[PDB]
């Protein structure tokens, strides 16, 4: 019988309008002493909104349904009168954002490793009919070894809200999401490109002085390909960051297989990648 009393709270990892994420220690059962992450949602906040209530259901369904090395693991889920609890694996490696912030610009080999692992996670989600939408580098964490974990499947984590599409940065989201004109898994391959661009140039591809100007630039999609990148990196970017969603690399029947076949990923051994037998560019434990 998993209860809130089965866990002691250690610290707040995140705080938002709908609740909190804690680092916790399990103090009962065979897992006594194990460290987890605990997401606690406020029911009252959520049930007063039909979309959020659906989104909260979707989150738990997704987590219970996916199982993949590069996607965060759900260990337990329960609820009380006022709270919904999700017990996730604790990831000690931080957000991908922090590595990018420290490094300024990734070397291409570094970027390739992360994008390669992410592509496998995306392919898994798409097989399950799930769209990730937003690969801004805060939405990707690293485990203790330095491997990728997609984490963002639930409610908007902001305290102030703009519907939640526009509540955080929109710089990594596809034009057709911003226009609300209907979309599909192709938006993830767009977002992979935006993240790649961020990794290799220091900033996402389309940024304006304000929110209005940023949206305009994304819709116009006039990509500036820096001349310094390899031909492979440039070609992959040009095929991901396209306004015509159907024509994006990855948007076809092959999905992730299409992207993973690109010359930019030519040195990647996918069997070894998936088994996490490939040495990551950064080791959080050593940092
Ligand atoms: C739960 C997976 C995880 C595993 N291991 C270590 N760190 C992790 N997280 C990943 C998520 N990250 C961001 C975040 N999501 C949030 C959601 C909320 C919400 F309750 F929905 F309002 C509030 C604050 C939030 N902060 C906090 C640390
Ligand atoms: Zn919001």
């Amino acid at each position: 019988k998993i209860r809130p009393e089965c866990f002691e709270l250690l610290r707040v990892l995140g705080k938002g309008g709908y609740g909190k994420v804690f680092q916790v220690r399990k103090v009962t059962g065979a897992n006594t002493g194990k460290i987890f992450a605990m997401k606690v949602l406020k029911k009252a906040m959520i049930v007063r909104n039909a979309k959020d209530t659906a989104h909260t259901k979707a989150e738990r369904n997704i987590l219970e349904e996916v199982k993949h090395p590069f996607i965060v693991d759900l260990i337990y889920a329960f609820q009380t009168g006022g709270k919904l609890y999700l017990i996730l694996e604790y990831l000690s490696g931080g957000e991908l954002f922090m590595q990018l912030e420290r490094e300024g610009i990734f070397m291409e080999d570094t970027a390739c490793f992360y994008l390669a692992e992410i592509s496998m996670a995306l392919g898994h989600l798409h097989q399950k009919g799930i769209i990730y939408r937003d690969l801004k580098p805060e939405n990707i964490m690293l485990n203790h070894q330095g491997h990728v974990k997609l984490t963002d499947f639930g409610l908007c984590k902001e305290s102030i809200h703009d519907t939640h599409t526009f509540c955080g940065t929109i710089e990594y989201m596809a034009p057709e999401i911003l226009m609300r004109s209907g979309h599909n898994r192709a938006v993830d391959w767009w977002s992979l490109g935006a993240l790649m661009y961020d990794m290799l140039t220091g900033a996402p591809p389309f940024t304006g002085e304000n929110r209005k100007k940023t949206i305009d630039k994304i819709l116009k999609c006039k990509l500036n390909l820096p001349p310094y990148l390899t031909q492979e990196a440039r070609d992959l970017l040009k095929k991901l960051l396209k306004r015509n969603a159907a024509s994006r690399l990855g948007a076809g029947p092959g999905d992730a297989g299409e992207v993973q076949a690109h010359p930019f990923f030519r040195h990647i051994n996918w069997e070894e990648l998936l088994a996490r037998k490939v040495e990551p560019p950064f080791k959080p434990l050593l940092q």
Side-chain angles (χ1 to χ4, degrees), residues 2-47 49-156 158-287:
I2 306 293
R3 292 145 50 247
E5 296 68 33
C6 295
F7 305 90
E8 75 184 4
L9 307 182
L10 305 193
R11 59 179 176 134
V12 178
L13 299 179
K15 172 187 165 68
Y18 294 110
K20 284 186 170 143
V21 176
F22 302 87
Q23 186 186 40
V24 303
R25 171 179 300 115
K26 184 141 190 300
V27 294
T28 59
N31 283 337
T32 292
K34 284 291 169 170
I35 301 308
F36 296 98
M38 171 190 274
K39 188 173 188 174
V40 186
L41 305 173
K42 301 178 170 189
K43 287 193 179 184
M45 303 276 299
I46 299 166
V47 303
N49 180 278
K51 302 302 173 300
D52 289 335
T53 297
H55 198 334
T56 291
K57 281 176 288 166
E59 173 180 40
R60 193 173 156 179
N61 292 336
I62 290 169
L63 294 179
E64 281 173 0
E65 181 57 20
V66 296
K67 186 167 57 183
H68 197 276
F70 303 136
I71 299 174
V72 67
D73 267 330
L74 178 70
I75 317 298
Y76 317 99
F78 48 99
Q79 55 187 316
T80 57
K83 298 170 167 179
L84 302 170
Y85 294 81
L86 298 168
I87 310 299
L88 298 124
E89 58 175 324
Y90 175 65
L91 310 167
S92 59
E95 303 170 341
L96 185 57
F97 177 86
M98 279 171 260
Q99 304 302 321
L100 248 185
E101 194 73 356
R102 191 200 50 251
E103 289 303 331
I105 291 178
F106 286 162
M107 313 291 298
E108 278 191 40
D109 297 25
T110 301
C112 180
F113 167 93
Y114 290 122
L115 300 167
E117 294 194 331
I118 291 160
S119 79
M120 302 197 81
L122 294 175
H124 186 79
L125 294 175
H126 297 172
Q127 278 289 323
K128 290 279 183 185
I130 300 167
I131 297 165
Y132 200 64
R133 293 163 64 86
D134 189 4
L135 286 166
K136 61 177 185 183
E138 307 145 41
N139 279 352
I140 302 138
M141 284 192 75
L142 305 178
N143 77 346
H144 60 87
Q145 311 161 299
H147 297 274
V148 162
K149 293 274 188 184
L150 298 193
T151 52
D152 179 40
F153 296 95
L155 293 174
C156 167
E158 307 296 336
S159 289
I160 58 177
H161 312 274
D162 186 84
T163 196
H164 296 278
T165 282
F166 297 90
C167 287
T169 178
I170 54 161
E171 282 162 344
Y172 304 83
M173 294 175 198
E176 62 273 22
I177 290 177
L178 307 184
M179 279 172 67
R180 293 181 168 128
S181 63
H183 67 272
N184 57 40
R185 56 187 170 84
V187 306
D188 288 345
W189 301 120
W190 165 284
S191 197
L192 188 70
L195 171 63
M196 177 174 180
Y197 195 101
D198 192 15
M199 283 173 175
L200 297 182
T201 74
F206 307 112
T207 61
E209 184 193 4
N210 59 43
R211 171 50 71 78
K212 169 60 183 169
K213 291 163 183 289
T214 300
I215 289 173
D216 282 343
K217 283 193 182 175
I218 290 170
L219 302 192
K220 173 175 177 182
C221 193
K222 182 173 175 172
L223 187 58
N224 184 332
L225 281 181
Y228 325 114
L229 301 189
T230 57
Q231 176 273 333
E232 292 84 9
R234 294 170 79 239
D235 187 72
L236 176 57
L237 286 169
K238 182 188 177 166
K239 288 169 169 177
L240 297 175
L241 288 169
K242 300 173 135 180
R243 182 78 159 93
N244 180 12
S247 78
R248 286 174 204 148
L249 189 68
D255 195 49
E258 289 187 342
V259 177
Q260 293 162 342
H262 191 275
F264 175 78
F265 294 108
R266 65 197 180 281
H267 302 296
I268 297 290
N269 178 324
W270 300 99
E271 182 188 343
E272 273 196 349
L273 194 72
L274 182 57
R276 286 178 292 192
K277 300 205 217 90
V278 180
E279 181 178 21
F282 299 112
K283 292 80 162 185
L285 258 172
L286 283 49
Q287 294 175 341

